[PDB]
Amino acid sequence: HHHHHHHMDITKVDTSGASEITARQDKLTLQGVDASHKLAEHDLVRMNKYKELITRVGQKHGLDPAIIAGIISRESRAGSALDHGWGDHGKGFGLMQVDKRYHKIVGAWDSEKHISQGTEILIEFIRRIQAKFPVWPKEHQLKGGISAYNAGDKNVRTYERMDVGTTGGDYSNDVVARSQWFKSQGY
Numbered sequence: 001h002h003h004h005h006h007h008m009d010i011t012k013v014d015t016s017g018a019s020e021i022t023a024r025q026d027k028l029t030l031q032g033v034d035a036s037h038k039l040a041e042h043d044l045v046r047m048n049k050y051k052e053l054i055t056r057v058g059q060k061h062g063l064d065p066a067i068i069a070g071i072i073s074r075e076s077r078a079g080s081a082l083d084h085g086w087g088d089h090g091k092g093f094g095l096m097q098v099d100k101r102y103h104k105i106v107g108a109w110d111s112e113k114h115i116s117q118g119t120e121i122l123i124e125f126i127r128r129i130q131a132k133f134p135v136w137p138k139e140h141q142l143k144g145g146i147s148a149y150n151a152g153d154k155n156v157r158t159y160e161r162m163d164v165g166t167t168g169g170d171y172s173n174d175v176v177a178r179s180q181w182f183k184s185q186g187y
């Protein structure tokens with residue numbers, strides 16, 4: 001079960017950005033990729049507090065820090081959406097919303113240890129999609145892995161419609177677009 005995500009490049013992944021449902025969280029009139037970019041921008045000042053940690057975690061895991069930032073923006077609005085680190089049902093923990101029912105949580109909610117745990121979980125989902133669909137373009141495997149972070153690898157059943165069944169019907173599309181935006185902010 002070797003890992004092999006070292007060729008993946010977030011800049012090559014196609015995206016249609018946020019759905020209307022997702023855009024409404026900031027009452028945006030923007031749509032799609034534009035909306036994702038604005039959602040990300042709204043989280044930038046908070047994200048920048050964590051940028052040094054996010055960068056270190058990405059480097060330590062061979063993953064683009066911008067992807068980690070995209071996940072954090074989507075999962076927790078860089079902490080703004082959380083109550084002492086917890087999601088609304090006390091199950092999701094931390095900037096990346098690790099599910100305490102699936103994992104033994106580690107670190108404070110805003111810690112490097114936490115960000116490493118969420119990042120490892122994402123990296124494992126990427127590995128699984130590479131295993132499940134070994135002939136796919138790596139861009140599609142990366143996008144599918146991101147979708148699986150929200151919906152599980154079991155939700156990735158076909159090449160088409162990957163974000164069907166994800167929260168908002170747009171999880172990987174939105175995360176990819178936010179990640180690209182953070183990359184252009186120097187993540």
Ligand SMILES: [Cl-]
Pocket residue numbers: 086087088089090091092
């Ligand atoms: Cl929750």
